[model samples]
Target chain A: LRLGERVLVVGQRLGTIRFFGTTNFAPGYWYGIELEKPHGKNDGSVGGVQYFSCSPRYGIFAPPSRVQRVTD
Target chain B: LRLGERVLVVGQRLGTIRFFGTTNFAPGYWYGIELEKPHGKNDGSVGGVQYFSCSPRYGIFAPPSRVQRVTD
Candidate 1:
């Protein structure tokens, strides 16, 4: 996955992945997304550290396993 | 995977992935590469249509599974 790639996180939420690979927020690679809807938890920030930028309540980080590329 | 991403194709060839997704030459997702060495087959053109542009003998297409991200 790469930045700006459309994705479906958790099998439901539609979003654009803004970040890829490891982060200080967790172990393993993570996909940082800016959801189409404001159904997320942060604005690309976690624990006061910013990994990417996005609208408030429209940002989230999902593991690679939980993120699926959206072609349509 | 995305364009311009550094990858290790076939675990040995060092290259930059210049194109991603389906191609007329193949049925599944393919990565069009520009290898550092002339260890490839085409110049980003498999048959006639160009999938990407690269130095002659430095372009090859590989399945996504054969490509590993080069973080360093």
Candidate 2:
């Protein structure tokens, strides 16, 4: 119920959120977005540094915050 | 209450009360102080920038938020 939803994107992005706080390339912050499609990269990594992990078939790393349901 | 009190800084830094309203760097109101420690940079540098000045070895900036004394 909480993990799965027929969601839509509004403020940030749309995905399972797969989770949060997964910055690996840098020493800051990031979020994981398992977009309904390829709107991001795989996990919170950069330059092959691989700060995080997730299937390329799953989600991608995103900005500071706000990963919600689809607005449209 | 009146200003000019040897307040222990909170929410930010700890410094002696000196002058008030010394803005030239970043705006939103600032407190020019002689910090009790190097808890501050040189002057009232909000983002590596200054709005006022004191002696580099003296005190310099405050937010006007938690500028209080050890009296309370």
Candidate 3:
């Protein structure tokens, strides 16, 4: 998905939530997310969540809701 | 555009196609693309297509149809 060193997202930003890491519910599915302040600032380092799915094209898709600060 | 740490696309995935670098059909245009096997595997390294346009935002855009196998 890294086309020419440019990163892009196709949805809205819902703020930080929490980290759950990869799960066995579905194989080959994982989520890696980092929460950032509203003004494009990083509050701190937070773990990420992953979910298994049937689409290898995306590999792992992370919803903005599940992304929260590690301290939260 | 790399916002923070994610890469995303806003369209459908159409297999490999021919690559024709950015053109003057519009200003600020470039095309780069790489073809991948339908079965989630790299067939061979193909030159990507990068398209630059007036979307001061997108900077560059590449359509799937413009992405063809390098060897072919």
Candidate 4:
């Protein structure tokens, strides 16, 4: 996703994913993800997902199911 | 609190608060607070408080009354 595009995972709506940097161990990949807030619920955890890849392309999409989304 | 000791504050019992560093502008001892969950409520905000100090000692315990803890 782009820096401000909202995406949905399961029943949770997530904020736009932001690009940070790629891992040095992984070549030709980029890392970008947005911080998420659990809507209308209060549990003590920072909720969000991280995307990993070998390049800086936003096309590299991943399912939140594949990633461990934080939940309280 | 050290790094893993649990402490209580107000009616809300809190996890062991963690210390970061001191601010240069103030001439008091250092600071800390635990990241807290809002019991059984659901609101979107990173909940915590920042402690301000100029030294590295632990006598300078402040109240959540003075600090703005996040609420959702």
lDDT of 1 by residue, B1-72 (tens): 442222211114557767887889869997777776554679999888898898887787777666665552
Every model: iRMSD: 18.1, 26.3, 12.8, 20.1
User: Each model's TM-score, in the order given?
Assistant: 0.43, 0.31, 0.23, 0.18
TM-scores of chain A across the candidates, in order, are 0.78, 0.45, 0.22, 0.23
Over 4 Å off, model 2: A1-72, B1-13, B43-53
DockQ of each: 0.02, 0.01, 0.05, 0.02
Query: By the DockQ metric, which is better: model 2 or model 4?
Result: 4
Error of 4 at B13 (Å): 3.3
Over the stretch A1-72, how does candidate 4's per-residue lDDT look in tens digits? 121122111222333333334443344533233323222121211133334322222112223232223332
Compared with the true structure, the alpha-carbon lDDT of candidate 1 equals 0.67
| Candidate 2 docking classification | incorrect
lDDT of 2 by residue, B1-72 (tens): 011111111123345555556466666765566654443446545565564555664455445454544433
Give the lDDT ranking, best first.
Answer: 1, 2, 3, 4
- On residues A5-62, what C-alpha lDDT tens digit does candidate 3 reach at each position? 3222122333222223445444543343332312121222223333322222223235
Total residue pair clashes for candidate 2: 15
**Candidate that would win on lDDT:** 1
Model 3 bad stretches (over 4 Å) = A1-19, A22-51, A61-72, B1-25, B37-72
Worst 10 residues of 2 chain B by lDDT: B1-10
Candidates 1 and 3: which is better by TM-score? 1
* lDDT for position A10 in model 1: 12
